[PDB]
Curated annotation (Swiss-Prot), chains A, D:
Organism ancestry: Eukaryota, Metazoa, Chordata, Craniata, Vertebrata
Effect of E52K: In AMYLD1; amyloid polyneuropathy
Gene Ontology, cellular component aspect: azurophil granule lumen; extracellular exosome; extracellular region; extracellular space; protein-containing complex
Descriptive protein name: Transthyretin
Organism: Homo sapiens (Human)
Phenotypic consequence of E80Q: In AMYLD1; amyloid polyneuropathy and cardiomyopathy
Effect of Y105C: In AMYLD1; amyloid polyneuropathy
Superkingdom of this protein's organism: Eukaryota
Record family assignment: Belongs to the transthyretin family.
Effect of S43P: In AMYLD1; amyloid polyneuropathy
Phenotype when changing S68Y: In AMYLD1; amyloid polyneuropathy
Length: 115, 116, 116, 115
């Protein structure tokens, strides 16, 4: 499992359940090509997006549908979504966890990178 | 100003000068049209991007070139950029401050919205 | 001012007014002595806490009453307060801004330090 | 396991290893009384601090020694430590995870609270 996503709710103090997540890779003509997708579990986690052989060097984008989450809770949001864009595997293959912390008018994101 | 951007360095506890910023709007055909651009000052702030009459209802994108900032200090960071996407002026005119806080492997972003 | 405090609400995207703030210093016998206090203004800022001559070398504590803010809005939050502890003026006089960003179950804090 | 602590490094993109952590409970005369302590693992986590029968209602403090971590890495820090103070079990017993994200001049903390 070379790529995982984990999401938390700063208003309720809980994992973020049933949030949609889409992954893209950058094409040669500089457009974004669809790569993988899913929804977060009861623990706020999304596993099994890709494999070691498929996840080659390149530039990748992860888009989290934060607007649809806040609307389901009846709370007004600022952002359309939360994004993360990064270059992968520049010094060999690694395991990547993308962690996000969500509020209606503010978010933070962090990468935890292992061998 | 109806739109201002402010940027800080979380390693050094200091404003970030000379950081490039590009703004886009979503057009009727669902493509991103260039709207405004500039660089941050000595205080880490960028003013004067637009006017109340130009800044109508719509979906806007703010892209901050964080990778060039870290590379000039000798560091290879995780992110290519930081990008903030939002609907503006839906309930009438407002003033927007977009703040960003930077680390080599993390960033946060906050919006302050006021009615004049 | 050599010391300023600024507070924001991450649910509403707005400055937080009327929030209580208390400052303490560490004395020679390792006990906390009261140093200064005040409340935030309409812009969410608190100025005028001390002077350059009073603000000597030492360890300082800034306590922000976040629980009273949330309770007045009908909310029972996780934290009792937010408390920031730091050594000041070790390498000569500097100016300090202590910022805090608030949610019911989370808070962040940042220091901006400048030389005049 | 009613109480757990998890810590991450925003400069290096890694869990925070071998950071000291102390826990206190508030006494009747308003002083802080020592309660438990330990160090973070290779995954940045600290388990086994207390039990369900010992962890009664009251006000608790968690202190993370962030200054000693940055000094070990040769990086100048702003804060003496990171603190978290909270009232526990007001509506019955819960499981609490205290999550912290660290930079030399800035930190964030969040509670994840389960049944």
């Amino acid at each position: 499992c070379p790529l995982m996503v984990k999401v938390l709710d700063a208003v309720r103090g809980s994992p973020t359940i049933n949030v949609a997540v889409h992954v893209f890779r950058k094409a040669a003509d500089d457009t974004w090509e669809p790569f993988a997708s899913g929804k977060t579990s009861e623990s706020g986690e999304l596993h099994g997006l890709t494999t070691e052989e498929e996840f080659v060097e390149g530039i990748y984008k992860v888009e989290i549908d934060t607007k649809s989450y806040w609307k389901a809770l009846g709370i007004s949001p600022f952002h359309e979504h939360a994004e993360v864009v990064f270059t992968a595997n520049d010094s060999g293959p690694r395991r990547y966890t993308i962690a996000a912390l969500l509020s209606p008018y503010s978010y933070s994101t962090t990468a935890v990178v292992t061998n």
